Amino acid sequence: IDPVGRIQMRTRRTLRGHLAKIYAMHWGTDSRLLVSASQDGKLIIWDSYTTNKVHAIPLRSSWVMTCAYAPSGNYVACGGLDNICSIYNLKVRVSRELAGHTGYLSCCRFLDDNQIVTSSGDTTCALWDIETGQQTTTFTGHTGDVMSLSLAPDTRLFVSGACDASAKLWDVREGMCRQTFTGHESDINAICFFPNGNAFATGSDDATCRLFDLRADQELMTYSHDNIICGITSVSFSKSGRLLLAGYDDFNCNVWDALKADRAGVLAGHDNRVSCLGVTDDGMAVATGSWDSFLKIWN
């Protein structure tokens, strides 16, 4: 096939309003407004075009591991070492709290205005009803702490990665495990869904990525190198699924080629670890945060 070739991108905007390290970020469905979370107990909603802070929310607990943006744009969420999921209304008032987990909250994703899916470090996931504020289902297959999750485009399934070198697929309606994949040697840090919804990618501490196809039930590609001896903190796909972007602990992000599986680019502009990484809904820009307290937008 025709290789992608060198992929050169440069920082367009830089967002500087956070005091501590960035731990998570998420984009809005409008492809303009994004929410980011910092360990200094602040939740800022930015404007990429102008870099103006639309909002700023002080959180009760300083250590937040994740944040989410409602697909309708009327709410947000976040959580961490407090073992709660806090949901804020954007009429900003704390509208609710979801408290059923036992370990720290690792990830969360809105299904609707009324439902949200969460994972915790107690090795379980759960589906909530926001109006009633109680769990509806639990998913209890994993053996190690769940680190990431990713909702399917139809919103009827999802995959989760755990600190056991394995992944699993769940039926939201049925609440039963469908499959299991074991290709890695150490903890899984990130997981993503391919645009078509029939695959996913995974980054681990053994310093490799791998691509799993649900129908074949086996790892297809293995994105590694002989000189990379660090783990992977985040992954993300592009609009077409042709470039896989992965952040590392070497302070740089690499732009892999999902099919040819040979690195095609690098984004070296952060002085510390690259923690979070997201791609816009309409595929126009890429945002990356780091432990340097700065957010950068690349095009």
Partner: peptide, 21 residues
């Protein structure tokens, strides 16, 4: 596995026209 690979490449080539990156 060949079928899955073929479908993945087909998708990637089919949606390559509108990928700004």
């Amino acid at each position: 596995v060949s079928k899955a690979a073929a479908d993945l490449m087909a998708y990637c080539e089919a949606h390559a026209k509108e990928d700004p990156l």
